[PDB]
Nucleic acid binder design. Structure first.
Ligand SMILES: Nc1ncnc2c1ncn2[C@@H]1O[C@H](COP(=O)(O)OP(=O)(O)O)[C@@H](O)[C@H]1O
Ligand SMILES: [Mg+2]
Length: 436
DNA sequence: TTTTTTT
């Protein structure tokens, strides 16, 4: 049931012994439905992983961290304390030893250390140290034009720069030992549903600011946020918070405040949600952690149904189901430099305990990455500031008419890091081999 | 500056 373009990639991946493939293209191009066809072909032989919970859900797999039991921190290069093989008689060891294919969805969101940790974990567990991924055939799928992987400041950023030169999956050293065969998908849903939108976005992918004039002519209407069924996106947290606060205060009903418990050193700028979180029944929220039992994910939108002491009920938009939310603990990690060997090392210095809930009438563009919305309004505020931020904001909706802007987009807000441009020009040949 | 993954 694949299109001709999808069948081309399906056959190029399944009917060759080559062990490393990348299937890439813009959103709506068929990557996920091709993944399902690959799963049906391989079924027992393949393990499906993704870097986020919502992507793992859409890929019918698990997160990379959960499968390999990686810690939620910087994965230092082949470091035995961050990358631990499974025990001698564990189910995970059997799963890795018998694995033939690893399917990795949304690979553009896989940070370089995550991918490298996969490589090392597979090599060590399978005892094939000289073969990339321990001889497992890796099928990467994803768009290469997204928000960059998260890289905190301080010694962590310096480590990643020193070790890999950057955060992207194509900067991993494993590509120096195996060639990545590339297969592009061009035909998108959007090309059929709104070709004008698809043409504008293609030019913006190419960094062409010319496209902004038509986009601004079509989409600028400052009152677009006042319309029903409209989620508001902002570049920064402060403006989204003010939006949410206004909606919360206008919502009739009795409020309940959830007070975080903070221990040790945890600056409030690093808080994953508000320390004093006030909620009302019916408030639009977004969940902030992945359920270990798979009933909800970080990024799930929903509505507050019940509010009680350290426990609330949320009705999920995704499936209409009810989930009960209790506090989670986040850790603050600091990396200290040893200054005599290379030797940075993590230490947990603080903890933050709070219900994993944030108000969601307004969201940041970063937080809305990976959601598909029916209608969005972009309240630009002081402006977009990150690689891919404009493109990700625009692509949250299916049609240009579903989008509105508070003001014209400026050419300074169309941002792409040159390393991503360089990698794209090299994967237009059909195969890519990282130098060194 | 500026925001976000991962348990
Ligand atoms: N071969 C196909 N047959 C039927 N529907 C398809 C096919 N390919 C894509 N679609 C539809 O197009 C939409 C986008 O496809 P998807 O696999 O989600 O693309 P992407 O992974 O790039 O977002 C999906 O909702 C899917 O229903
Ligand atoms: Mg996809």
């Amino acid at each position: 049931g694949l299109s001709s373009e999808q069948q081309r990639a399906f056959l190029a991946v399944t009917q060759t012994p080559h062990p490393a493939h990348l299937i890439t293209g813009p959103a709506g191009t068929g990557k996920t439905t091709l993944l399902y066809a690959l799963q049906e072909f391989y079924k027992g032989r393949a393990v499906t992983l993704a870097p986020t919970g919502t992507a793992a859900l859409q890929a019918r797999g698990q997160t990379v961290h959960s499968f390999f039991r990686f810690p939620a921190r910087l994965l230092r290069y082949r470091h035995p304390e961050d990358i631990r093989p499974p025990g001698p008689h564990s189910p995970l060891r059997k799963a890795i030893e018998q694995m033939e294919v690893l399917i990795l969805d949304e690979v553009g969101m896989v940070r370089v250390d995550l991918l490298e940790a996969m490589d090392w974990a597979l090599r060590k567990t399978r005892k094939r140290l000289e073969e990339p991924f321990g001889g497992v055939k890796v099928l990467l799928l994803g768009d290469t034009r997204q928000l960059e992987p998260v890289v905190p400041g301080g010694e962590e950023a310096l480590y990643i720069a020193r070790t890999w030169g950057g955060p992207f999956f194509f900067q991993a050293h494993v590509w120096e030992e195996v060639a990545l065969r590339v297969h592009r998908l061009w035909e998108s849903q959007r090309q059929r549903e709104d070709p004008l939108f698809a043409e504008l976005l293609k030019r913006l992918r190419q960094g062409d600011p010319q496209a902004l004039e038509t986009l601004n002519r079509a989409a600028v209407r400052p009152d677009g946020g006042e319309e029903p069924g409209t989620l508001i996106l902002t570049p920064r947290r402060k403006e989204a918070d003010a939006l949410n606060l206004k909606r919360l205060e206008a919502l009739p009903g009795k409020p309940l405040e959830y007070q975080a418990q903070v221990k040790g050193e945890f600056a409030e700028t690093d808080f994953p949600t508000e320390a004093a979180l006030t909620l009302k029944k019916g408030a639009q929220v977004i969940l902030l952690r992945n359920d270990p039992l798979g009933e909800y994910f970080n990024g799930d939108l929903g509505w507050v149904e019940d509010l009680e002491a350290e426990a609330l009920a949320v009705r999920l938009k995704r499936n209409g189901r009810r989930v009960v939310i209790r506090p989670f603990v986040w850790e603050k990690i600091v990396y200290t430099y040893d200054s005599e060997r290379e030797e940075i090392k993590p230490q947990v210095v603080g903890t933050f305990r709070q219900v994993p809930v944030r108000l969601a009438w307004a969201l940041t563009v970063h937080k809305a990455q990976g959601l598909t919305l029916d209608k969005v309004h972009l309240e630009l505020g002081r402006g977009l500031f990150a690689h891919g931020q404009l493109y990700v904001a625009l692509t949250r909706v299916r049609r240009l008419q579903d989008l509105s802007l508070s003001r014209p987009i400026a050419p300074t807000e169309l941002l792409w890091r040159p390393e991503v441009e360089v990698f794209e020009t090299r994967i237009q040949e059909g195969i890519w081999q990282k130098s060194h």
